Symmetry: C4
């Protein structure tokens, strides 16, 4: 595989159509799904030349741990839909690559099983029916050795995914929510913050004032995101809000971005716009579908080489240097 | 049906081509018809997160009455072209959904018949040959229980609809103007205002100074509109003027918009740009053609669910909150 | 015919390909030819409503004569290429419609013959080999009753028309320059100005400072133009310079525009951007090819109806009112 | 041949696919390769009229020598891939046209052989393994009569050219680096500057501050360039940075540009944006592939005629006048 797009073609060949559509799809007309790509494609980097590249490193420190790349695997529910080893295949590959893996509340293998793989597991939270049960998922994750709580804040309920409606998609019998909902509010955030000493990271922030309030609320991070175009159809891409958000928080929490990251050059763009790191979703699932654990490993190796290549071509010996790159908007 | 576009495909299957073209078409090169869609597609919403959604409501108060959604059925002439029950089918569905229905001067069923259906009927006025006759349509509508007079101000004469010219389109013998023209001026507006205590709503305003003068003239509302691209070919879309107009009137009348609204997400965009409410035209006729009254009911149910979904995903428990959302222009 | 585009299809059917390509083509990659259309299509008009349209008139006064429309027939060389009656057919139709016709230095019928048709003939000048001969064409035109000298200033030499090169195009033997060159300068302009009391109109101005210098030089008008994309490939469209030029001359001469005018709505756009009038080239030749004099008459009747329709839909009882319309740039 | 695009079609016919792909390709998704073209196509020139064109000249003085056109042949490695005479064919044609030819460090004929052709040879440097060897290539080039050292500064390592990866491309046995690497830094630049009295020209500058530092470092020139989209995928086109860079250096060194120059009109655009001169890469290789030396001669003759045509149509008797032209950005 020489690009992430080789993995999409391979996954489309193997997966049943309805499962590929569950993975690929967005809400509504898929305007936000398409815009994630449009927005990255319009961004051009202004590279620097003639800088020392003796010791180029793609490593970052985030939430108290070194990561090999400025990237983590996004939370994607129900990974046994894609391969029989599901979450465990992906988590093992992530661990071996040195990148954090986000364990989902709707994982198809229990969070404790996945955490036992090792590595840098984070845990993604959906707010449940009651405060007490939500907090017991958080405590389970903490007890299992997860390093951060990624509280998804863009899902008061799930968006309208028309592909899934048209296909009548449902989980096969052999895929379940192995860890076993209500709209979250700022009160819910405070309940979680008070319940754990782990960093709380709010995923699905797009308004500048929500980013500021996240810092004020004691978040350790945010993920600037439209949920891969799966929630509000017409929501702005995160990449379009990122520079404004980075300025507004002015170092008060880590600022991650996701949506449409499909290469190491896209990772460079995100960092040049101010991101601490990115999440990658769909491509990880394509690799899992195509070739299981070894597929995910190959994807992460490819991304690592693309990120190193882009950084050095742009004159950046470190991710911090990449954050200081300037950008220019173009057309098409 | 899971989107309004499913209803267009269904209506195209059933209607005779020349009738579909009367419905679908615009004037000239159809530049304004296309631009209505282009303009909405370029608008992205910046949603808010973590707000209380216990009691999300899509209701609004307008012209002294509660409406179930921030939407009314636009005036569309000659609805018996589309289904044999024509206006009565649509009016019954609108009533049962709690949304206002605009009775046309060129209705194919008499205004009194349609008003007798109940609901929240408004009445759309075309200025006639003489002041006295125009005013007698207005008084008829008022006597029949219509709640607002929607004075169409963008039709000194009808635009050049080339599809209709090419097809040699004419009304079938079995469709007539069941209520049975000259260019309206500001004097005409004053004559109507003096003749009725109902709110007068000027439909087809696009210039900012015309919006201000409408308020000064005692209008209770305006509809910011290029008449669905059927009048001046090259007229700006209403959605492109709306934010400027909302600012200029600064609460002095209700500001509605129409043209290309095709989803609850489009309704959210319009409200985020400052609209009090939208009108929907073509899609209502697609539903009527496809399945009569029950079709229109299904369309309104679908729109209601899309509007609620979009509002809540965007953090809005009320339409007023939606009006306070910010937006960003994108590409394609 | 219900649009000017119906006439292009008709002309393409009848003309030999190499002649159609001589007519249709531009220089180079045809970027400026395409951009003339792109630029008009991006312009949207903000129409006004509720104004008195009792006496809508499309007439203007220009160069001391009333014209029926704010339009003249552009200079197009060698009109016998398109129809055997050539210039005389077009001139007769123009006369009968009340619009000026521009007689070309490279006309295929002598300027005196064409002037004898009557109407409002103008005369287009290419600068010759020597001052004395150039001035004798000007004096011939004046003696024949031409009303204005349209000095073409964008042709130091002819552009590179690749269609014509690829086709090996040459004039048939039966088409000649019936009135029978060097680069013009500002000195040439002064020589012409001193030689005639007719208004001198400089055609092919695009830089703002050239527009100002034209006024200072005693021009009675300019035509803001890239020569229909036939001269510099990459030259800005005139419509893109027009508003800036209108502001800079601040009423010191008439400011016409050409390039891509294909409807009465395009005429309205040009006037809203500040043009006194437009020239129309290719479409007049399409009508001539399709149906001779009667074709040109039908085209002018169609344009007159489109201009009246657009003006009134936009609330303009006069061309001066149209000049006061505002515009908004859109997309696609 | 009447455009440079006729030469691409001819080269595609003759070359083996993998060699055509080595020539045509870019890195990654080829976004920067495409953007070079997009960016030029969006630029429109505002031509001037009525200026004296008695003695139009396309000549410039650069690096102490007259050149016939504001253009040089870009460095392209391994020209024997394209034709058996390789570099010698191109160098002879360049010499006979009066335009500089850039001899590559990775030339397939030795630099001394190519320099012996005569003309205005420049020499392109890739930084080697050690300072001493790099400097001995520079001294070789100087001893052979090269006039400038074009130090390529955008290649710490070669970009990821996916076409070449997919094709498994390798040099045939009969093509070698006939003159026979590490990342260059600002120290490397100083070492070269101290070693030669020839002008040092830094090729691959895109950041404004890198342009300024180049002047401060004693460069005689820069080439504003993204390496034809072959290095960082997502790097801004040089043409998009050029105006800003020209302003920042404020005459302190020559400022060249490359990437996508495909006509004399593109040369005019570059000069209007402030370039001293352009480089042309791919098209020279197309001509070499199509017809060897005589092909390159025909290409240079065509470009010379296009540059003269564009300059004069734009009112420019000299390249300096062309630099004073203004431009406007358009769409598509
Ligand atoms: C099939 C699928 C399932 C997802 N499940 C979750 C989830 O359970 N929790 C969550 O916070 N995000 C979820 N996401 C959103 C991703 O975490 C991420 O925001 C999104 O996929 C955008 O990134 P991409 O373009 O890299 O896929 C899901 C995405 C997909 C495609
Ligand atoms: C077939 C048809 C007939 C119409 N008749 C009228 C009318 O009688 N009065 C009026 O004010 N508007 C009329 N309109 C305009 C609509 O009220 C509305 O402004 C327009 O359809 C734009 O909305 P849409 O894109 O939702 O269709 C008509 C529209 C259509 C398509
Ligand atoms: C076939 C052809 C011949 C032309 N000949 C002349 C000419 O002799 N003199 C001149 O000033 N312009 C000439 N023009 C330019 C036109 O006057 C006008 O500027 C141009 O056609 C743009 O308008 P259009 O898009 O309406 O064709 C010619 C145009 C065409 C298509
Ligand atoms: C096949 C190929 C080989 C190249 N080799 C070199 C090189 O050895 N050194 C260098 O500085 N640039 C090299 N370049 C880049 C060119 O000098 C130039 O920057 C680029 O081709 C952009 O111009 P174009 O669009 O005119 O091709 C190469 C380009 C191509 C296409
Ligand atoms: O978009 C995220 C998602 C998560 C679980 C089920 C369906 C969708
Ligand atoms: O159906 C899954 C879900 C997840 C979070 C909130 C609401 C629903
Ligand atoms: O307007 C900001 C922006 C940022 C990234 C991509 C597109 C737009
Ligand atoms: O565009 C509105 C309309 C109304 C009646 C007849 C024809 C068209
Ligand atoms: O033909 C219908 C009509 C309506 C209003 C004004 C003029 C004409
Ligand atoms: O320029 C304002 C605007 C508003 C909505 C859509 C497109 C443009
Ligand atoms: O573009 C104008 C023209 C005029 C005469 C001959 C060829 C072209
Ligand atoms: O070939 C026609 C012509 C016209 C004006 C200037 C130069 C050439
Ligand atoms: O930038 C001004 C403009 C004017 C008309 C069309 C396109 C652009
Ligand atoms: O892009 C330039 C190049 C040079 C030598 C080998 C391969 C590529
Ligand atoms: O492979 C060729 C090369 C050239 C310059 C730097 C690194 C590699
Ligand atoms: O924004 C500057 C620019 C310059 C040339 C082409 C495109 C953009």
């Amino acid at each position: 595989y020489v690009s992430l797009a080789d993995l999409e073609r391979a996954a489309r060949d193997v997966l049943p159509g309805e499962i590929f559509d569950f993975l690929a799809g967005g809400s509504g007309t898929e305007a936000s799904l398409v815009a994630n790509r449009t927005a990255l494609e319009r961004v051009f980097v202004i590279p620097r030349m003639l800088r020392d590249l003796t010791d180029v490193t793609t490593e970052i420190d985030i939430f108290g741990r070194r990561a090999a790349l400025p990237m983590a695997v996004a939370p994607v529910a129900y990974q046994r839909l894609f391969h029989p080893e599901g979450e465990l295949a992906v988590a093992r590959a992530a661990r071996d690559a040195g990148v954090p893996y986000t364990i989902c509340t709707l994982s198809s293998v229990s969070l404790e099983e996945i955490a036992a793989v090792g590595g840098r597991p984070w845990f993604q939270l959906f707010w449940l029916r009651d405060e007490k049960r939500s907090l017991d998922l958080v405590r389970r994750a903490e007890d299992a050795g997860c390093e951060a709580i990624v509280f998804t804040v863009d899902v008061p309920w799930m968006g309208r995914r028309l592909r899934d409606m048209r296909n009548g998609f449902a989980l096969p019998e052999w895929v379940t929510a192995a860890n076993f909902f209500a709209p979250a509010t700022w009160e819910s955030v405070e309940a979680v913050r008070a319940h754990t000493d782990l960093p709380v990271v709010l995923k699905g922030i797009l308004a500048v004032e929500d980013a500021r309030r996240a810092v004020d609320a004691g978040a350790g991070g945010i993920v600037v995101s439209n949920h891969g175009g799966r929630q509000l159809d017409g929501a702005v891409p995160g990449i379009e809000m990122l520079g404004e958000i980075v300025a507004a928080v002015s170092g008060g929490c880590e600022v991650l971005v996701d949506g449409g990251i499909r290469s190491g050059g896209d990772v460079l763009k995100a960092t040049a716009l101010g991101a601490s790191a990115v999440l990658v979703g769909r491509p990880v699932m394509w690799a899992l579908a195509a070739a299981g654990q070894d597929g995910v490993r190959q994807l992460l190796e490819l991304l690592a080489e693309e990120v190193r290549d882009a950084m050095g071509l742009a004159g950046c010996e470190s991710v911090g240097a990449a954050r200081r790159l300037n950008t220019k908007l173009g057309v098409v």
